[PDB]
PDB file of all heavy atoms in Angstrom:
ATOM      1  N   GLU G  39      17.625   2.813  -2.737  1.00 13.64           N
ATOM      2  CA  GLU G  39      16.580   1.826  -2.355  1.00 13.64           C
ATOM      3  C   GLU G  39      15.234   2.339  -2.871  1.00 13.64           C
ATOM      4  O   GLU G  39      14.809   3.429  -2.433  1.00 13.64           O
ATOM      5  CB  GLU G  39      16.550   1.594  -0.841  1.00 13.64           C
ATOM      6  CG  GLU G  39      17.431   0.433  -0.392  1.00 13.64           C
ATOM      7  CD  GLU G  39      17.521   0.188   1.110  1.00 13.64           C
ATOM      8  OE1 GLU G  39      17.107   1.078   1.889  1.00 13.64           O
ATOM      9  OE2 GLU G  39      18.016  -0.894   1.502  1.00 13.64           O
ATOM     10  N   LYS G  40      14.602   1.584  -3.777  1.00 12.74           N
ATOM     11  CA  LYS G  40      13.199   1.808  -4.224  1.00 12.74           C
ATOM     12  C   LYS G  40      12.319   2.083  -3.000  1.00 12.74           C
ATOM     13  O   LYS G  40      12.508   1.385  -1.974  1.00 12.74           O
ATOM     14  CB  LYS G  40      12.646   0.574  -4.940  1.00 12.74           C
ATOM     15  CG  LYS G  40      13.099   0.386  -6.381  1.00 12.74           C
ATOM     16  CD  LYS G  40      12.049  -0.305  -7.234  1.00 12.74           C
ATOM     17  CE  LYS G  40      11.644  -1.666  -6.706  1.00 12.74           C
ATOM     18  NZ  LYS G  40      10.463  -2.188  -7.424  1.00 12.74           N
ATOM     19  N   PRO G  41      11.370   3.042  -3.051  1.00 12.64           N
ATOM     20  CA  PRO G  41      10.486   3.316  -1.916  1.00 12.64           C
ATOM     21  C   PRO G  41       9.880   2.028  -1.344  1.00 12.64           C
ATOM     22  O   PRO G  41       9.897   1.864  -0.141  1.00 12.64           O
ATOM     23  CB  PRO G  41       9.396   4.211  -2.511  1.00 12.64           C
ATOM     24  CG  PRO G  41      10.076   4.905  -3.659  1.00 12.64           C
ATOM     25  CD  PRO G  41      11.087   3.911  -4.188  1.00 12.64           C
ATOM     26  N   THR G  42       9.356   1.160  -2.213  1.00 14.29           N
ATOM     27  CA  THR G  42       8.770  -0.154  -1.834  1.00 14.29           C
ATOM     28  C   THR G  42       9.741  -0.894  -0.914  1.00 14.29           C
ATOM     29  O   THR G  42       9.280  -1.424   0.110  1.00 14.29           O
ATOM     30  CB  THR G  42       8.393  -1.015  -3.049  1.00 14.29           C
ATOM     31  OG1 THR G  42       7.991  -2.289  -2.543  1.00 14.29           O
ATOM     32  CG2 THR G  42       9.509  -1.218  -4.050  1.00 14.29           C
ATOM     33  N   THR G  43      11.027  -0.924  -1.264  1.00 12.70           N
ATOM     34  CA  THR G  43      12.085  -1.636  -0.501  1.00 12.70           C
ATOM     35  C   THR G  43      12.339  -0.900   0.817  1.00 12.70           C
ATOM     36  O   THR G  43      12.650  -1.578   1.811  1.00 12.70           O
ATOM     37  CB  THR G  43      13.362  -1.786  -1.337  1.00 12.70           C
ATOM     38  OG1 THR G  43      12.997  -2.436  -2.556  1.00 12.70           O
ATOM     39  CG2 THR G  43      14.437  -2.581  -0.628  1.00 12.70           C
ATOM     40  N   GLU G  44      12.216   0.430   0.813  1.00 15.30           N
ATOM     41  CA  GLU G  44      12.434   1.302   1.999  1.00 15.30           C
ATOM     42  C   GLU G  44      11.295   1.075   3.001  1.00 15.30           C
ATOM     43  O   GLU G  44      11.579   1.037   4.213  1.00 15.30           O
ATOM     44  CB  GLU G  44      12.533   2.765   1.561  1.00 15.30           C
ATOM     45  CG  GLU G  44      13.143   3.685   2.605  1.00 15.30           C
ATOM     46  CD  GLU G  44      12.203   4.120   3.723  1.00 15.30           C
ATOM     47  OE1 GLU G  44      11.166   4.761   3.414  1.00 15.30           O
ATOM     48  OE2 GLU G  44      12.515   3.826   4.901  1.00 15.30           O
ATOM     49  N   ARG G  45      10.060   0.934   2.511  1.00 17.64           N
ATOM     50  CA  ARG G  45       8.858   0.662   3.343  1.00 17.64           C
ATOM     51  C   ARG G  45       8.937  -0.761   3.905  1.00 17.64           C
ATOM     52  O   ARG G  45       8.606  -0.939   5.091  1.00 17.64           O
ATOM     53  CB  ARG G  45       7.571   0.846   2.535  1.00 17.64           C
ATOM     54  CG  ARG G  45       7.281   2.288   2.149  1.00 17.64           C
ATOM     55  CD  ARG G  45       5.913   2.442   1.511  1.00 17.64           C
ATOM     56  NE  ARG G  45       5.778   1.654   0.290  1.00 17.64           N
ATOM     57  CZ  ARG G  45       5.525   2.152  -0.918  1.00 17.64           C
ATOM     58  NH1 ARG G  45       5.352   3.455  -1.082  1.00 17.64           N
ATOM     59  NH2 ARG G  45       5.440   1.346  -1.962  1.00 17.64           N
ATOM     60  N   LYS G  46       9.355  -1.722   3.080  1.00 18.07           N
ATOM     61  CA  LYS G  46       9.389  -3.164   3.435  1.00 18.07           C
ATOM     62  C   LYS G  46      10.342  -3.384   4.614  1.00 18.07           C
ATOM     63  O   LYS G  46      10.018  -4.230   5.468  1.00 18.07           O
ATOM     64  CB  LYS G  46       9.808  -4.020   2.237  1.00 18.07           C
ATOM     65  CG  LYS G  46       9.719  -5.522   2.475  1.00 18.07           C
ATOM     66  CD  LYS G  46       9.931  -6.360   1.233  1.00 18.07           C
ATOM     67  CE  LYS G  46      11.362  -6.357   0.742  1.00 18.07           C
ATOM     68  NZ  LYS G  46      11.502  -7.133  -0.512  1.00 18.07           N
ATOM     69  N   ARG G  47      11.470  -2.668   4.655  1.00 16.74           N
ATOM     70  CA  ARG G  47      12.519  -2.851   5.694  1.00 16.74           C
ATOM     71  C   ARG G  47      12.135  -2.057   6.950  1.00 16.74           C
ATOM     72  O   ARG G  47      12.519  -2.488   8.051  1.00 16.74           O
ATOM     73  CB  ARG G  47      13.903  -2.477   5.152  1.00 16.74           C
ATOM     74  CG  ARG G  47      14.173  -0.985   5.025  1.00 16.74           C
ATOM     75  CD  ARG G  47      15.533  -0.729   4.400  1.00 16.74           C
ATOM     76  NE  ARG G  47      15.940   0.668   4.463  1.00 16.74           N
ATOM     77  CZ  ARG G  47      16.341   1.291   5.568  1.00 16.74           C
ATOM     78  NH1 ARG G  47      16.414   0.637   6.713  1.00 16.74           N
ATOM     79  NH2 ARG G  47      16.678   2.569   5.519  1.00 16.74           N
ATOM     80  N   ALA G  48      11.413  -0.943   6.794  1.00 20.46           N
ATOM     81  CA  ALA G  48      10.831  -0.164   7.911  1.00 20.46           C
ATOM     82  C   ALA G  48       9.813  -1.040   8.650  1.00 20.46           C
ATOM     83  O   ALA G  48       9.869  -1.102   9.895  1.00 20.46           O
ATOM     84  CB  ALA G  48      10.198   1.103   7.395  1.00 20.46           C
ATOM     85  N   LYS G  49       8.922  -1.690   7.892  1.00 21.58           N
ATOM     86  CA  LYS G  49       7.905  -2.653   8.393  1.00 21.58           C
ATOM     87  C   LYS G  49       8.618  -3.791   9.127  1.00 21.58           C
ATOM     88  O   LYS G  49       8.288  -4.029  10.301  1.00 21.58           O
ATOM     89  CB  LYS G  49       7.084  -3.210   7.226  1.00 21.58           C
ATOM     90  CG  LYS G  49       5.891  -4.080   7.603  1.00 21.58           C
ATOM     91  CD  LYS G  49       4.735  -3.303   8.199  1.00 21.58           C
ATOM     92  CE  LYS G  49       3.431  -4.074   8.176  1.00 21.58           C
ATOM     93  NZ  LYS G  49       3.529  -5.352   8.922  1.00 21.58           N
ATOM     94  N   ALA G  50       9.564  -4.447   8.450  1.00 26.50           N
ATOM     95  CA  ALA G  50      10.318  -5.626   8.942  1.00 26.50           C
ATOM     96  C   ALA G  50      10.990  -5.300  10.279  1.00 26.50           C
ATOM     97  O   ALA G  50      10.923  -6.147  11.188  1.00 26.50           O
ATOM     98  CB  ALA G  50      11.333  -6.056   7.912  1.00 26.50           C
ATOM     99  N   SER G  51      11.612  -4.122  10.387  1.00 22.67           N
ATOM    100  CA  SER G  51      12.342  -3.652  11.593  1.00 22.67           C
ATOM    101  C   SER G  51      11.370  -3.554  12.775  1.00 22.67           C
ATOM    102  O   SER G  51      11.651  -4.163  13.827  1.00 22.67           O
ATOM    103  CB  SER G  51      13.038  -2.336  11.339  1.00 22.67           C
ATOM    104  OG  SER G  51      12.099  -1.287  11.151  1.00 22.67           O
ATOM    105  N   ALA G  52      10.268  -2.821  12.589  1.00 22.08           N
ATOM    106  CA  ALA G  52       9.201  -2.589  13.592  1.00 22.08           C
ATOM    107  C   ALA G  52       8.629  -3.927  14.076  1.00 22.08           C
ATOM    108  O   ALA G  52       8.365  -4.044  15.287  1.00 22.08           O
ATOM    109  CB  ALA G  52       8.126  -1.711  13.001  1.00 22.08           C
ATOM    110  N   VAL G  53       8.443  -4.890  13.168  1.00 24.10           N
ATOM    111  CA  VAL G  53       7.934  -6.258  13.481  1.00 24.10           C
ATOM    112  C   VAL G  53       8.956  -6.981  14.367  1.00 24.10           C
ATOM    113  O   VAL G  53       8.516  -7.706  15.280  1.00 24.10           O
ATOM    114  CB  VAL G  53       7.613  -7.060  12.204  1.00 24.10           C
ATOM    115  CG1 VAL G  53       7.403  -8.542  12.489  1.00 24.10           C
ATOM    116  CG2 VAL G  53       6.411  -6.487  11.467  1.00 24.10           C
ATOM    117  N   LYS G  54      10.257  -6.798  14.117  1.00 23.77           N
ATOM    118  CA  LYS G  54      11.348  -7.419  14.921  1.00 23.77           C
ATOM    119  C   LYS G  54      11.449  -6.716  16.281  1.00 23.77           C
ATOM    120  O   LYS G  54      11.583  -7.431  17.291  1.00 23.77           O
ATOM    121  CB  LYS G  54      12.689  -7.394  14.180  1.00 23.77           C
ATOM    122  CG  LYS G  54      12.849  -8.451  13.093  1.00 23.77           C
ATOM    123  CD  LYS G  54      14.290  -8.694  12.671  1.00 23.77           C
ATOM    124  CE  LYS G  54      14.954  -7.482  12.048  1.00 23.77           C
ATOM    125  NZ  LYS G  54      16.348  -7.770  11.635  1.00 23.77           N
ATOM    126  N   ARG G  55      11.396  -5.378  16.307  1.00 27.01           N
ATOM    127  CA  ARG G  55      11.405  -4.569  17.559  1.00 27.01           C
ATOM    128  C   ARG G  55      10.247  -5.011  18.462  1.00 27.01           C
ATOM    129  O   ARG G  55      10.470  -5.149  19.680  1.00 27.01           O
ATOM    130  CB  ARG G  55      11.272  -3.071  17.266  1.00 27.01           C
ATOM    131  CG  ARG G  55      12.520  -2.420  16.685  1.00 27.01           C
ATOM    132  CD  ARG G  55      12.461  -0.906  16.783  1.00 27.01           C
ATOM    133  NE  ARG G  55      11.274  -0.344  16.149  1.00 27.01           N
ATOM    134  CZ  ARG G  55      10.888   0.924  16.251  1.00 27.01           C
ATOM    135  NH1 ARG G  55      11.605   1.782  16.955  1.00 27.01           N
ATOM    136  NH2 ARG G  55       9.784   1.330  15.646  1.00 27.01           N
ATOM    137  N   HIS G  56       9.064  -5.216  17.874  1.00 30.93           N
ATOM    138  CA  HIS G  56       7.806  -5.559  18.591  1.00 30.93           C
ATOM    139  C   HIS G  56       7.867  -7.011  19.080  1.00 30.93           C
ATOM    140  O   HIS G  56       7.448  -7.276  20.223  1.00 30.93           O
ATOM    141  CB  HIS G  56       6.591  -5.304  17.691  1.00 30.93           C
ATOM    142  CG  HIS G  56       5.285  -5.313  18.409  1.00 30.93           C
ATOM    143  ND1 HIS G  56       4.986  -4.429  19.423  1.00 30.93           N
ATOM    144  CD2 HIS G  56       4.199  -6.083  18.257  1.00 30.93           C
ATOM    145  CE1 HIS G  56       3.760  -4.670  19.865  1.00 30.93           C
ATOM    146  NE2 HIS G  56       3.263  -5.669  19.170  1.00 30.93           N
ATOM    147  N   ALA G  57       8.375  -7.919  18.239  1.00 31.80           N
ATOM    148  CA  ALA G  57       8.495  -9.371  18.523  1.00 31.80           C
ATOM    149  C   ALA G  57       9.566  -9.622  19.592  1.00 31.80           C
ATOM    150  O   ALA G  57       9.507 -10.684  20.240  1.00 31.80           O
ATOM    151  CB  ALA G  57       8.804 -10.126  17.252  1.00 31.80           C
ATOM    152  N   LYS G  58      10.512  -8.690  19.763  1.00 30.69           N
ATOM    153  CA  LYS G  58      11.574  -8.753  20.803  1.00 30.69           C
ATOM    154  C   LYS G  58      10.945  -8.497  22.180  1.00 30.69           C
ATOM    155  O   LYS G  58      11.465  -9.049  23.170  1.00 30.69           O
ATOM    156  CB  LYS G  58      12.699  -7.760  20.485  1.00 30.69           C
ATOM    157  CG  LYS G  58      13.965  -7.909  21.324  1.00 30.69           C
ATOM    158  CD  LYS G  58      13.996  -7.058  22.581  1.00 30.69           C
ATOM    159  CE  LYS G  58      14.333  -5.606  22.312  1.00 30.69           C
ATOM    160  NZ  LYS G  58      14.284  -4.792  23.549  1.00 30.69           N
ATOM    161  N   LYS G  59       9.865  -7.707  22.237  1.00 29.84           N
ATOM    162  CA  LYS G  59       9.094  -7.424  23.479  1.00 29.84           C
ATOM    163  C   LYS G  59       8.412  -8.714  23.951  1.00 29.84           C
ATOM    164  O   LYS G  59       8.538  -9.040  25.146  1.00 29.84           O
ATOM    165  CB  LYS G  59       8.053  -6.323  23.250  1.00 29.84           C
ATOM    166  CG  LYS G  59       8.607  -4.966  22.828  1.00 29.84           C
ATOM    167  CD  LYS G  59       9.434  -4.268  23.892  1.00 29.84           C
ATOM    168  CE  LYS G  59       8.627  -3.809  25.088  1.00 29.84           C
ATOM    169  NZ  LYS G  59       7.570  -2.842  24.707  1.00 29.84           N
ATOM    170  N   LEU G  60       7.734  -9.420  23.038  1.00 30.44           N
ATOM    171  CA  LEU G  60       7.024 -10.702  23.310  1.00 30.44           C
ATOM    172  C   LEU G  60       8.042 -11.822  23.567  1.00 30.44           C
ATOM    173  O   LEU G  60       7.663 -12.817  24.215  1.00 30.44           O
ATOM    174  CB  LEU G  60       6.110 -11.052  22.130  1.00 30.44           C
ATOM    175  CG  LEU G  60       4.766 -10.320  22.069  1.00 30.44           C
ATOM    176  CD1 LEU G  60       4.024 -10.412  23.396  1.00 30.44           C
ATOM    177  CD2 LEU G  60       4.945  -8.866  21.657  1.00 30.44           C
ATOM    178  N   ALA G  61       9.278 -11.665  23.076  1.00 29.59           N
ATOM    179  CA  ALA G  61      10.411 -12.597  23.295  1.00 29.59           C
ATOM    180  C   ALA G  61      11.249 -12.148  24.502  1.00 29.59           C
ATOM    181  O   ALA G  61      12.400 -12.616  24.621  1.00 29.59           O
ATOM    182  CB  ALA G  61      11.251 -12.682  22.042  1.00 29.59           C
ATOM    183  N   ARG G  62      10.692 -11.284  25.363  1.00 30.42           N
ATOM    184  CA  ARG G  62      11.308 -10.846  26.646  1.00 30.42           C
ATOM    185  C   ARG G  62      10.497 -11.396  27.828  1.00 30.42           C
ATOM    186  O   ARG G  62      11.116 -11.679  28.873  1.00 30.42           O
ATOM    187  CB  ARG G  62      11.408  -9.318  26.703  1.00 30.42           C
ATOM    188  CG  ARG G  62      12.332  -8.799  27.796  1.00 30.42           C
ATOM    189  CD  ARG G  62      12.585  -7.304  27.704  1.00 30.42           C
ATOM    190  NE  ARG G  62      11.398  -6.506  27.984  1.00 30.42           N
ATOM    191  CZ  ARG G  62      11.376  -5.177  28.026  1.00 30.42           C
ATOM    192  NH1 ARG G  62      12.479  -4.486  27.794  1.00 30.42           N
ATOM    193  NH2 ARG G  62      10.249  -4.541  28.299  1.00 30.42           N
ATOM    194  N   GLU G  63       9.173 -11.536  27.677  1.00 30.79           N
ATOM    195  CA  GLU G  63       8.263 -12.109  28.710  1.00 30.79           C
ATOM    196  C   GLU G  63       8.587 -13.595  28.912  1.00 30.79           C
ATOM    197  O   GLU G  63       8.866 -13.981  30.065  1.00 30.79           O
ATOM    198  CB  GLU G  63       6.790 -11.932  28.330  1.00 30.79           C
ATOM    199  CG  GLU G  63       6.231 -10.558  28.660  1.00 30.79           C
ATOM    200  CD  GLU G  63       6.597  -9.456  27.681  1.00 30.79           C
ATOM    201  OE1 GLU G  63       6.095  -9.495  26.540  1.00 30.79           O
ATOM    202  OE2 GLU G  63       7.364  -8.552  28.067  1.00 30.79           O
ATOM    203  N   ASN G  64       8.547 -14.389  27.836  1.00 31.60           N
ATOM    204  CA  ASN G  64       8.815 -15.855  27.859  1.00 31.60           C
ATOM    205  C   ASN G  64      10.308 -16.081  28.135  1.00 31.60           C
ATOM    206  O   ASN G  64      11.037 -16.478  27.203  1.00 31.60           O
ATOM    207  CB  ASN G  64       8.350 -16.541  26.569  1.00 31.60           C
ATOM    208  CG  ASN G  64       6.855 -16.431  26.348  1.00 31.60           C
ATOM    209  OD1 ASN G  64       6.412 -15.850  25.360  1.00 31.60           O
ATOM    210  ND2 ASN G  64       6.073 -16.984  27.260  1.00 31.60           N
ATOM    211  N   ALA G  65      10.727 -15.848  29.384  1.00 33.40           N
ATOM    212  CA  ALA G  65      12.134 -15.888  29.853  1.00 33.40           C
ATOM    213  C   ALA G  65      12.174 -15.677  31.372  1.00 33.40           C
ATOM    214  O   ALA G  65      12.802 -16.501  32.068  1.00 33.40           O
ATOM    215  CB  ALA G  65      12.949 -14.843  29.130  1.00 33.40           C
ATOM    216  N   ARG G  66      11.536 -14.605  31.855  1.00 34.18           N
ATOM    217  CA  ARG G  66      11.357 -14.299  33.302  1.00 34.18           C
ATOM    218  C   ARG G  66      10.240 -15.179  33.876  1.00 34.18           C
ATOM    219  O   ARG G  66      10.340 -15.559  35.062  1.00 34.18           O
ATOM    220  CB  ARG G  66      11.023 -12.818  33.506  1.00 34.18           C
ATOM    221  CG  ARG G  66      12.092 -11.856  33.003  1.00 34.18           C
ATOM    222  CD  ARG G  66      11.775 -10.411  33.347  1.00 34.18           C
ATOM    223  NE  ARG G  66      10.503  -9.972  32.784  1.00 34.18           N
ATOM    224  CZ  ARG G  66       9.454  -9.566  33.493  1.00 34.18           C
ATOM    225  NH1 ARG G  66       9.509  -9.534  34.814  1.00 34.18           N
ATOM    226  NH2 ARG G  66       8.347  -9.190  32.876  1.00 34.18           N
ATOM    227  N   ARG G  67       9.220 -15.484  33.063  1.00 34.74           N
ATOM    228  CA  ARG G  67       8.009 -16.250  33.465  1.00 34.74           C
ATOM    229  C   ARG G  67       8.316 -17.753  33.418  1.00 34.74           C
ATOM    230  O   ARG G  67       8.032 -18.443  34.418  1.00 34.74           O
ATOM    231  CB  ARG G  67       6.827 -15.902  32.553  1.00 34.74           C
ATOM    232  CG  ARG G  67       6.501 -14.414  32.475  1.00 34.74           C
ATOM    233  CD  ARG G  67       5.941 -13.839  33.764  1.00 34.74           C
ATOM    234  NE  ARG G  67       4.556 -14.221  34.009  1.00 34.74           N
ATOM    235  CZ  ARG G  67       3.508 -13.748  33.341  1.00 34.74           C
ATOM    236  NH1 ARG G  67       3.677 -12.854  32.383  1.00 34.74           N
ATOM    237  NH2 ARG G  67       2.289 -14.165  33.639  1.00 34.74           N
ATOM    238  N   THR G  68       8.873 -18.230  32.297  1.00 34.00           N
ATOM    239  CA  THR G  68       9.202 -19.659  32.039  1.00 34.00           C
ATOM    240  C   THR G  68      10.618 -19.961  32.547  1.00 34.00           C
ATOM    241  O   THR G  68      11.495 -19.084  32.410  1.00 34.00           O
ATOM    242  CB  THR G  68       9.050 -19.996  30.548  1.00 34.00           C
ATOM    243  OG1 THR G  68       7.752 -19.565  30.129  1.00 34.00           O
ATOM    244  CG2 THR G  68       9.220 -21.470  30.244  1.00 34.00           C
TER     245      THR G  68
END
């Protein structure tokens, strides 16, 4: 994996991990 591709998927993963936190509130509240 080209470094660029390795960074892009590291970024993408962290964005999904973080967005899963915000997609945990809108469930207990709503």
Side-chain angles (χ1 to χ4, degrees):
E39 268 176 346
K40 282 211 302 170
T42 174
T43 305
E44 197 281 300
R45 291 187 300 241
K46 186 171 71 183
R47 76 184 190 73
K49 187 72 162 59
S51 68
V53 167
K54 282 198 297 181
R55 286 196 304 170
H56 193 61
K58 191 268 282 177
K59 299 293 292 300
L60 280 309
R62 195 171 68 177
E63 278 79 69
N64 298 118
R66 300 185 301 118
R67 305 291 285 287
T68 308

